[PDB]
Amino acid sequence: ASEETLAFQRQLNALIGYDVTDVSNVHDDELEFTRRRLVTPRMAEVAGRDPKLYAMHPWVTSKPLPEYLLKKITNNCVFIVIHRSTTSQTIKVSADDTPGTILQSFFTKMDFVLRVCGRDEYLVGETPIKNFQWVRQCLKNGEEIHLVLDTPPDPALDEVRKEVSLWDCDRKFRVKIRGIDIPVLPRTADLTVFVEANIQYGQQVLCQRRTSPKPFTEEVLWNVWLEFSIKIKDLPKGALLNLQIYCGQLLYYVNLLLIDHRFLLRHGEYVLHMWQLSFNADKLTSATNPDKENSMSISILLDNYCHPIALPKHEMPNQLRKQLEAIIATDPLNPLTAEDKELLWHFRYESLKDPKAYPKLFSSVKWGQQEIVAKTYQLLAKREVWDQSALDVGLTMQLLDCNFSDENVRAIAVQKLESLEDDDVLHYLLQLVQAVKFEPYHDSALARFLLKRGLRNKRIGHFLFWFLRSEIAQSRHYQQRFAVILEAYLRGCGTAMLHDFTQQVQVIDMLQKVTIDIKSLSAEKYDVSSQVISQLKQKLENLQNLNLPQSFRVPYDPGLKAGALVIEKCKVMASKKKPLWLEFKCADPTALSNETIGIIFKHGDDLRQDMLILQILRIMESIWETESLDLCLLPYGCISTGDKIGMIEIVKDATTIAKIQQSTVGNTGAFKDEVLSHWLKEKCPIEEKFQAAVERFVYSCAGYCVATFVLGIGDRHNDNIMISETGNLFHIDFGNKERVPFVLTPDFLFVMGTSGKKTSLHFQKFQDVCVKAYLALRHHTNLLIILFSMMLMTGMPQLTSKEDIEYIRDALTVGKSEEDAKKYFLDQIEVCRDKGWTVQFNWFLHLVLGI
Ligand SMILES: O=c1c(O)c(-c2ccc(O)c(O)c2)oc2cc(O)cc(O)c12
């Protein structure tokens, strides 16, 4: 234990934002055990990754080129402008030649490598140029691919630092509830409370027992023994002893894994500190409440016994086969009757041939029966139909949600994920990282898969860091487990990344202190005091001096390096919440422009919800890639940094729809349908440009209508919708009456050439693109269902319900034929033109006038 070895932990601890060594809030040593067990999976990843490729994190995709990009490449060639000094050469190149044929073919025309100008994005390795996302991005963006020739980075910068019985216990299970202790009680005194003890598994309660009600006092005793109807030998690994307390309604809960990470049956005394309620993921944690001084506690007693340990295991009637498929063919949200289940089970080996049955089949399992489980494991010993199945993210996600607590059922889904290439991991990472909250133990296959894909790739690890840190900073329920996974990662990403993260962490702490210190200059009046402006430009000075790091990677776009702050352009938005608007220079001289990097840091909205939505949006964008479509969404970058703070990308050349109305019209709701188009034109003199800023609108507007309606958030005020001086429209702020499917106001239809209720050229163009994108999603109904369902379970602070999830099922018209569907959407589009500005005017009355 040298000083060097201690300093390291200390740094990592401040990088994580929680002390992973702490042991003040543990009733066992699972965390310590898990930090120790991750040491091996990390080393294996570090030692087996190529130093260079890892050093340059090439970004690629072995997927085909969409139909909308194919058409953008004359024959099979493309141009690439290479820059040396100020020299520049344009070259037509073999669309299929490794970045190696280039260079060599360049040397023969006019120890290096190609890099995207102004960005840390290298095109290297044995991959067809066209398979590089940067290229594909430029093509669709009709932009010139500018690459500067520079020296390859030196892997040395990624240097890693120096490193007794069995089942048989035919007895039942029981627990003693001695009492509950709370140093304080509710104002609305004179209450009654009781302890409820449930033996849970996969959100399913196998058994349950209570205690008698008593008045709610600072100390309620019982010393009552509760006997459960289940046999010790029947408790499965991952089962939770869920302890709850109701008050004459749920109010406090805590949980304890009955079988620990060593396979032992928990025993002994326990004083667990409980979480209080204000249905969702937090209710499943094995973590205890750290605030011991203010948190209700529960004193319980577990049967003192020697050492009970769990042992690690070693054609049909048509008419029936038909009803079996009727069940296997039901969306994820459909229930399962007792008959449905028994049927599914009896025909295990049959149901087993179809991968889409796994979620349903493994839920008909009676996990409270040791005998049934064993067969279940036997049933999996032979996983040929699965092993050989084609990876289905949607199906695999369903096995990782809160319905399965079994280690072997989850591991098979993780097994199918090993098959994802980096470009896909990056599409499902956020949700894969949220899924860790359903793991019953801190060490898991899914937890090791995220370590492994992180250590193995810089883009993935850059994000894994932020997705976890986001949860460690504002989740007391899961900070410990996530803190252990992030430490393990920080221990193999390299000295380089370790230094970047630090630059980022500094800039963020410093800048958020400012954000809050500025909000406190007027928490109720939308008046950017002339002094409030000088006040801000002043703190940025103090910091910008010799404190704030001169530069830093942009967390939501790692391939970008921020330079200094352009204090002049910095301001405090005229928003109730007073978000900061900051501008920075790019720190890369080779950048082919002088444009700044804009970032907004804000307090008061939950940006974890925005990350969730924004990510599902990129997922939709990729779902349309397969069906060969481009809806022009613009999921700007957004990263939750702490409680109700975080950063947001500033999309250039863009404004609020409402603001557009406000200028032409004014500070009232008499909205003029022509303002928008009169805005595009003024910002796009050149016909060819304006004529192109209209097609974008049609597509962008269409896509958000669809995406926003499928997610159930299509109804919102004008202020939450934005447009770019290139016509790209895009939603924002996702933080008894009138309603609408989405936003398709009169001004929008005006841009498309339809003053009245008469179809137009662009309108039909829009109508076709809609139904098209809409139907393209249904082709993934299940994927969207389980994604929407995971989201509500880990992204919503309030307890969500089935009724909440089901919405998505209707919006996607499950069990319906494409025909009916096409219509459903077109009808929804109709309600829009039938309410014109109705809903907006109302919103303006509610949000603006406080009515
Ligand atoms: O690009 C912009 C952007 O991304 C956001 C944004 C994103 C998420 C939020 O939750 C939020 O409140 C605002 O606002 C803006 C506001 C302007 O006036 C101009 C802009 O260019 C943006």
Q: State whether 274 and 316 are in the same domain.
A: no
Q: State whether 657 and 693 are in the same domain.
A: yes
Q: State whether 243 and 343 are in the same domain.
A: no
Ligand 1 centroid, distance to 633 Cα (angstroms): 15
CA distances from residue 162 to 8, 290, 491, 500 in whole angstroms, order as listed: 11, 32, 10, 20
**CA distance linking residue 410 with residue 639, whole number of Å:** 29
Tell me if 435 sits within 8 A of 397, measured CB to CB.
Answer: yes
Taking the chain, what is the end-to-end CA distance rounded to the nearest angstrom?
64
Check residue 732 and give left, alpha or beta (phi > 0: left; psi -120 to 50: alpha).
beta
**DSSP string of 599-653?**
EEEEESS-HHHHHHHHHHHHHHHHHHHHTT---------EEEEETTEEEEE--SS
The CB density around residue 154, as the number of other CB atoms within 10 Å, is: 12
Ligand 1 atom with minimal separation from the 655 CA: 19
> Residue positions in the annotated binding site for ATP?
598-607, 633-641, 730-735
Tell me if 433 sits within 8 A of 450, measured CB to CB.
Answer: yes
Residues contacting 75, CB < 8 A, separation 6+: none
Q: State whether 698 and 762 are in the same domain.
A: yes
CATH number at residue 432: 1.25.40.70
**CA distance linking residue 571 with residue 849, whole number of Å:** 26
CATH number at residue 794: 1.10.1070.11
Does any ligand 1 atom lie closer than 6 A to the CB of residue 636?
A: yes
Q: State whether 490 and 343 are in the same domain.
A: yes
Chain position carrying tokens 């998505």: 808
Residue 850 belongs to a domain: no
Q: Give the burial class of 231: count Cβ atoms within 10 A of its Cβ; 0-12 exposed, 13-18 middle, 19 or more buried.
A: middle
Say how far residue 175 (Cα) sits from the centre of its chain: 38
Ligand 1 atom with minimal separation from the 575 CA: 12
Structure token digits, residue 104 = 């060599």
CATH number at residue 251: 2.60.40.150
**DSSP string of 464-500?**
HHHHHHHHHHH-TTTHHHHHHHHHHHHTTS-HHHHHH
Report chain breaks in the chain, C–N > 2.5 Å, as residues after which they occur: 110, 163, 248, 278, 314, 735
Residue 71 belongs to a domain: yes
Amino acid residing at 155: P
Structure obtained using: X-ray
Tell me if 417 sits within 8 A of 215, measured CB to CB.
Answer: no
CATH number at residue 585: 3.30.1010.10
Does any ligand 1 atom lie closer than 6 A to the CB of residue 650?
A: yes
Ligand 1 centroid, distance to 558 Cα (angstroms): 20
Q: State whether 695 and 835 are in the same domain.
A: yes
What is the rounded (10 degree) CA torsion for 140, 142, 144, 147?
-10
| Domain closes at, from 494, 524, 546 | 494
Residue nearest (by alpha carbon) to ligand 1 atom 6: 732
Residues 7, 9, 10: CA angle, nearest 5 degrees: 60
Q: State whether 159 and 181 are in the same domain.
A: no
Amino acid residing at 339: E
Buried b (16+ CB within 10 A) or exposed e, 610-625: bbbbbbbbebbbebbb
Does any ligand 1 atom lie closer than 6 A to the CB of residue 592?
A: no
Task: Name the residue of 597, 648, 700, 716 to mutate for ligand 1: max ligand atoms within 8 A of Cβ.
Answer: 648
CA distances from residue 708 to 510, 576, 812 in whole angstroms, order as listed: 35, 25, 12
Does any ligand 1 atom lie closer than 6 A to the CB of residue 730?
A: no
Ligand 1 centroid, distance to 648 Cα (angstroms): 7
Ligand 1 centroid, distance to 157 Cα (angstroms): 36
The DSSP output letter for 452 is: H
Residue 506 belongs to a domain: yes
Q: Does residue 173 sit in helix, strand or coil?
A: strand
Ligand 1 atom with minimal separation from the 652 CA: 21
Residue 849 belongs to a domain: no
Domain count for the chain, please give it.
5
Tell me if 75 sits within 8 A of 478, measured CB to CB.
Answer: no
Tell me if 654 sits within 8 A of 634, measured CB to CB.
Answer: no
What is the rounded (10 degree) CA torsion for 335, 337, 340, 342?
130
Residue nearest (by alpha carbon) to ligand 1 atom 2: 650
Residue 53 belongs to a domain: yes
Ligand 1 atom with minimal separation from the 654 CA: 21
Ligand 1 centroid, distance to 260 Cα (angstroms): 47
Ligand 1 centroid, distance to 463 Cα (angstroms): 22
Q: State whether 317 and 456 are in the same domain.
A: yes
Amino acid residing at 158: D
Residues contacting 818, CB < 8 A, separation 6+: 775, 778
Q: State whether 291 and 366 are in the same domain.
A: no
**CA distance linking residue 114 with residue 120, whole number of Å:** 11
Ligand 1 centroid, distance to 580 Cα (angstroms): 11
**CA distance linking residue 671 with residue 657, whole number of Å:** 11
Closest CA to 485 of 458, 502, 459, 467: 467
Structure token digits, residue 678 = 């009169």
The strand ranges marked E within 38-137 are 77-83, 88-94, 114-116, 122-123
Residue nearest (by alpha carbon) to ligand 1 atom 18: 655
The CB density around residue 370, as the number of other CB atoms within 10 Å, is: 17
Q: State whether 334 and 271 are in the same domain.
A: no
Q: State whether 778 and 703 are in the same domain.
A: yes
Closest CA to 653 of 638, 641, 668, 636: 636
Closest CA to 203 of 808, 807, 791, 793: 793
Closest CA to 31 of 691, 335, 482: 482
Residue 846 belongs to a domain: no
Please provide the size of the chain in residues.
851
CATH number at residue 75: 3.10.20.90
Domain range enclosing 592: 495-652
Q: State whether 400 and 441 are in the same domain.
A: yes
